[PDB]
C-alpha cells in the first residue's frame, strides 16, 4: 500500500528493442552505489555484423537516470571456416534473462544458435555470459556434443535463470530432449575457472542436470521458469521450475533437490491449457522461515455469475510446512484476458510489518492494455487475498502491447530508506519504472466517553452564554504514532469528531458539543514518533426531550483522524503514509437512560 506512484523513476530504451523485457537490481559488493539492470533483447549493438543481438543496460538511480550498455561481448560471430560461421548472434535475444548476485551478473541469449563442428547446422542451444568484475566468461551448458532435438541442440539454455544462496547458478532450457526441457545447475566457481575460449563444450565438474526421460514427457517445457528455495530443510536452496505443457497441458511445477537434482515434490494444474507454470516464485510469505511456492496460470478460465467461462488467470499459493506437505490456495485474476499471474515478484517486506509481500502482474489489464500490477501483503495465516495496492501503466504503444508488468523485481532498498522497492518493466513501450516504498506510520488512537449512560433529567452543565440546565458528558480522544526508517520527528494530524453520526441526513441529531453547539468538532494536532499518548478533552450535551422522541437508538461518538502527508516529507521527497491495516476511524456509543 506504501509504494510511491505519484513520482516514480522512469527509464527508456531504444524504440523496438524491448527495453524492460527483463529487470533486476545490481548491488556491487563494496557497499557502493546501486543500479538497475534492464534487458533489451532486440537492441542493436556494435558487434560487427550482428543485427538485434540484444544488450543489458546498467542504469544509475537518480544521479542522472541514465542507462549505459554493459559490455558482455563486443565480438561478432566466430568462424568455423571462411564464410562458415561457428555461431549466429543476430536476434539471439541477449538480455531476455538477467540475474544479479552481489558482484556477479548473469545474462543469457536463449535464441543464440551454433553451427557445430561436424556439420553445418543452426541449433538454438542458447548461451549466457557471466561477469563478476573485469572477469567475463561464456556459459553455454547446453552447447554440448548432444546435438539435435533428441539431444540438447534446441535446448535454448538460459531461457530462465536464478542464483542460489550458495553461489550456484540455476538455469533452465525448455527445448532439451524433444522439448522435455532441462534444468542445469553449475557452481559459479566452476563456470569461471573451467572457462576456455578454445573449448566450446566445457566439462564442468559437480554439474547437476535433469536426465532424458521417456518420450511420453516430450514437449513439456521443463525450465520454462525457475525459482529457488529450501524445501527439505537442509539449508541448501532447491530448484523450483515450471513445466507448463506437462500432464497433457494441465501444467506442472517440479521441485528438485538442490544437492543432487533428485525429485522432491510435484504440483499439477487444474485446467487444460491454463499455462500453469508460466511463472514461479519462492518466498516465505507468512513468517515461519519456510519458503512458500507461488505458481502462475495466466490463462486459467474462471466461471462467472452467468455461468460463462472467462479467461482471467490464476495464481496458486502453497505454504510449506515442516511435515513436508503444502497448504495451497488459489488467487484469481480480476480482468478478462489480462493474464493475471504472468509475473510474480517477491517484494521482501514492503510495508515492514514483519511479513514478506508479493506483486502479481496482469500485463494486459487496465485501460488500452496498459497493464496492471497488484500488491499482496503477507500475514501469519498466509497471503492476504485482497490486493492492498494497484499499479497502472501510463504508456500506450502502436506495435506490440506495452505489457507493463511482464517482468518485475523487488526486495531491494535502493534508496536506503528502510523499505524494499520495486522495478516494473514494460517492453512493449521500451520502458522500465522504479517504484519506491514510502515509510509506514503505525497510529494508535483512543476514544473515551464518560459518563456512558446519560440521564436527560440530570442537568449539571450550563450552555455558552446565560443559558443553563443541560445534560452533559465528556469526550476524550487520543492519538499516538510511531514508525520505522527515515521519518521526521514531528507529525501534523487532522482529527475530526462527530456526535450522533449514525443518524442519516434528515434525521434529528440528539447530541451537540457544548462550545460549538454543533455535532462536529475539528482539530489540528502534533505528535512525535514513539511519543506518549497525546490526548484532549471536551464536553458535549444532549438536546431537550421535546426536540427528539428517539431515546432508543444509541448515540455514536465518531472519530476520524487524517494526516497532512506533504509536511512530513524527506530529502528523497518521499512522504510517509498511514498504516492501511489499522483503521483510521474509531467509535464509541453512549445510551439514553430510560424510566
Amino acid at each position, epitope marked *: 500500500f506504501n509504494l510511491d506512484v505519484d513520482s516514480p523513476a522512469e527509464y527508456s530504451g531504444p524504440e523496438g528493442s524491448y527495453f524492460g523485457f527483463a529487470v533486476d537490481f545490481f548491488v556491487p559488493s563494496a557497499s557502493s552505489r546501486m543500479f538497475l539492470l534492464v534487458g533489451a533483447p532486440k537492441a542493436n549493438t556494435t558487434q560487427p555484423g550482428i543485427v538485434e543481438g540484444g544488450q543489458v543496460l546498467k542504469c544509475d538511480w537518480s544521479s542522472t537516470r541514465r542507462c549505459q550498455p554493459i559490455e558482455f561481448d563486443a565480438t561478432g560471430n566466430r568462424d568455423y*571456416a571462411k564464410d562458415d560461421p561457428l555461431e549466429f548472434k543476430s536476434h539471439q535475444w541477449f538480455g531476455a534473462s538477467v540475474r544479479s548476485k552481489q558482484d556477479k551478473i548473469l545474462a543469457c541469449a536463449p535464441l543464440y544458435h551454433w553451427r557445430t*563442428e561436424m556439420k553445418q547446422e543452426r541449433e538454438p542451444v542458447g548461451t549466457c555470459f557471466l561477469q563478476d568484475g573485469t572477469k567475463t566468461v561464456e556459459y553455454a551448458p547446453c552447447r*554440448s*556434443q*548432444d546435438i539435435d532435438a*533428441d*539431444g*540438447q541442440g534446441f535446448c535454448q539454455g538460459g531461457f530462465s535463470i536464478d542464483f542460489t544462496k550458495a553461489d550456484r547458478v540455476l538455469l533452465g532450457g525448455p527445448g532439451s530432449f524433444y522439448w522435455q526441457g532441462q534444468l542445469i545447475s553449475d557452481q559459479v566457481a566452476e563456470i569461471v575457472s*573451467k572457462y*576456455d575460449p*578454445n*573449448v*566450446y*563444450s566445457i*566439462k*564442468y*565438474n559437480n*554439474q547437476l*542436470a535433469t*536426465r*532424458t526421460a521417456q518420450a511420453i514427457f516430450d514437449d513439456s517445457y521443463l525450465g520454462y521458469s525457475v525459482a529457488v528455495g529450501d524445501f527439505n530443510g537442509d539449508g541448501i536452496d532447491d530448484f523450483v521450475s515450471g513445466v507448463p505443457r506437462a500432464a497433457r497441458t494441465l501444467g506442472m511445477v517440479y521441485i528438485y533437490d538442490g544437492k543432487n537434482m533428485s525429485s522432491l515434490y510435484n504440483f499439477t494444474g487444474e485446467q487444460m491449457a491454463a499455462y500453469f507454470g508460466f511463472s514461479v516464485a519462492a518466498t516465505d510469505i507468512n513468517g515461519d522461515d519456510y519458503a512458500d511456492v507461488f505458481i502462475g496460470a495466466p490463462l486459467f478460465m474462471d466461471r462467472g455469475s452467468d455461468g460463462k467461462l472467462q479467461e482471467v488467470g490464476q495464481v496458486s499459493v502453497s505454504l510449506q510446512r515442516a511435515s513436508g506437505d503444502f497448504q495451497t490456495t488459489k488467487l484469481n485474476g480480476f480482468e478478462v484476458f489480462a493474464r493475471f499471474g504472468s509475473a510474480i515478484a517477491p517484494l521482501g517486506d514492503l510495508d515492514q510489518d514483519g511479513f514478506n509481500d508479493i506483486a502479481i502482474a496482469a500485463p494486459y489489464g487496465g485501460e488500452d492494455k496498459k497493464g496492471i500490477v497488484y500488491i499482496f501483503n503477507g500475514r501469519s495465516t498466509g497471503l492476504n487475498a485482497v490486493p492492498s495496492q494497484i499499479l497502472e501503466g501510463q504508456w500506450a504503444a502502436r506495435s506490440c502491447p506495452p505489457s507493463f508488468g511482464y517482468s518485475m523485481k523487488g526486495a531491494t532498498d535502493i534508496d536506503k530508506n528502510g523499505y524494499p522497492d520495486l522495478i516494473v518493466g514494460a517492453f512493449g513501450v521500451d520502458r522500465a519504472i522504479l517504484y519506491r516504498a514510502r515509510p509506514v506510520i503505525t497510529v494508535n488512537a483512543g476514544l473515551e466517553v464518560y459518563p456512558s449512560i446519560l440521564n436527560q433529567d440530570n442537568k449539571t452543565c450550563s450552555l455558552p452564554g446565560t443559558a443553563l440546565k443541560v445534560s452533559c458528558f465528556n469526550v476524550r480522544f487520543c492519538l499516538k504514532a510511531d514508525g520505522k526508517g527515515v521519518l521526521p520527528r514531528k507529525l501534523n494530524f487532522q482529527v475530526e469528531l462527530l456526535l450522533d453520526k449514525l443518524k442519516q441526513k434528515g434525521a434529528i441529531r440528539r447530541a451537540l458539543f457544548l462550545y460549538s453547539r454543533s455535532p462536529s468538532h475539528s482539530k489540528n494536532m502534533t505528535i512525535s514518533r514513539g511519543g506518549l499518548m497525546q490526548c484532549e478533552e471536551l464536553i458535549a450535551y444532549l438536546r431537550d426531550e421535546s426536540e427528539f422522541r428517539d431515546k432508543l437508538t444509541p448515540i455514536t461518538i465518531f472519530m476520524e483522524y487524517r494526516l497532512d502527508y506533504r509536511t512530513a516529507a524527506d530529502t528523497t521527497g518521499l512522504q510517509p503514509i498511514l498504516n492501511q491495516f489499522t483503521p483510521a476511524n474509531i467509535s464509541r456509543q453512549a445510551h439514553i437512560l430510560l424510566d
Partner: antibody
Amino acid sequence: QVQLQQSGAELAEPGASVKMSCKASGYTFSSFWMHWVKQRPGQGLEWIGYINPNSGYTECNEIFRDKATMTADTSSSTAYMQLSGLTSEDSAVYYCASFLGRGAMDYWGQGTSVTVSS
Amino acid sequence: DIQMTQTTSSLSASLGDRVIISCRASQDISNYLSWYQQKPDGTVKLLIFYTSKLHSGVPSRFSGSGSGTDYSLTISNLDQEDIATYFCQQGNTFPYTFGGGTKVEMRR
C-alpha cells in the same frame, strides 16, 4: 578431476568375444562423446570409433565396423565396448577417451589389455 | 584416410634441451592436429589441440605450431618427466588417424 576407469585385463579364446567397461567421473557423461583407441604391443595408436552416450549413435573406422560394438549406460556413466570374433590381431590394449571437441580427446583411461590365445 | 607420419621415430635429448617433434599429414587438415604424451606405463595425456592450444593442466613448456600439412610439437626446458613417446593426431576428418610416434630418451 575427470577420471575414466576401465575394467581389468580380458582373456579369451579365438573366435570368442570380450566386453570391457569405462566408467566416467568428474563431468557429465551424457553430454560428451566417448572414443575408443586400439594399441597393439609395441605398435602405434588405432582409432576405432566414438559413441554419443545419450543417444547411442556410433561411428566406427571402416576396419572395426564388424569387429567392435559400442554401448553406454547413462545411469552409471559407463561406456562399454564389445570385441567379437576374436583373433590374435585383436590382442592389444584398448583405451577409452572422452571427446574434448576440436577433433581432440582430452581424457584417457588407463587401458584394458586383451589377450587372445588357446 | 589421412596418413600421419612422424619421420623421426626416436630422438635423444638432455635435461633443459629444446625438443622439436615433426608431424606431416597426407592432406590439408586445417590445423585440426593434436599432440599426446604416452609414458612407459601406458598412461596417455593430451598436451596440444588445434595445433597450438594447451590443454588444461599441462605445463607451459609444451607448445604447438604448424598449418596445412606440416606441424610440430616443441618442448622447451625438457624435464625428467618429459621422457615419453609423443603422438600426433589429425581430427579434421574421420577416421581419426595417429602418427607413428616419436620417442624421447635421455642422453648419456
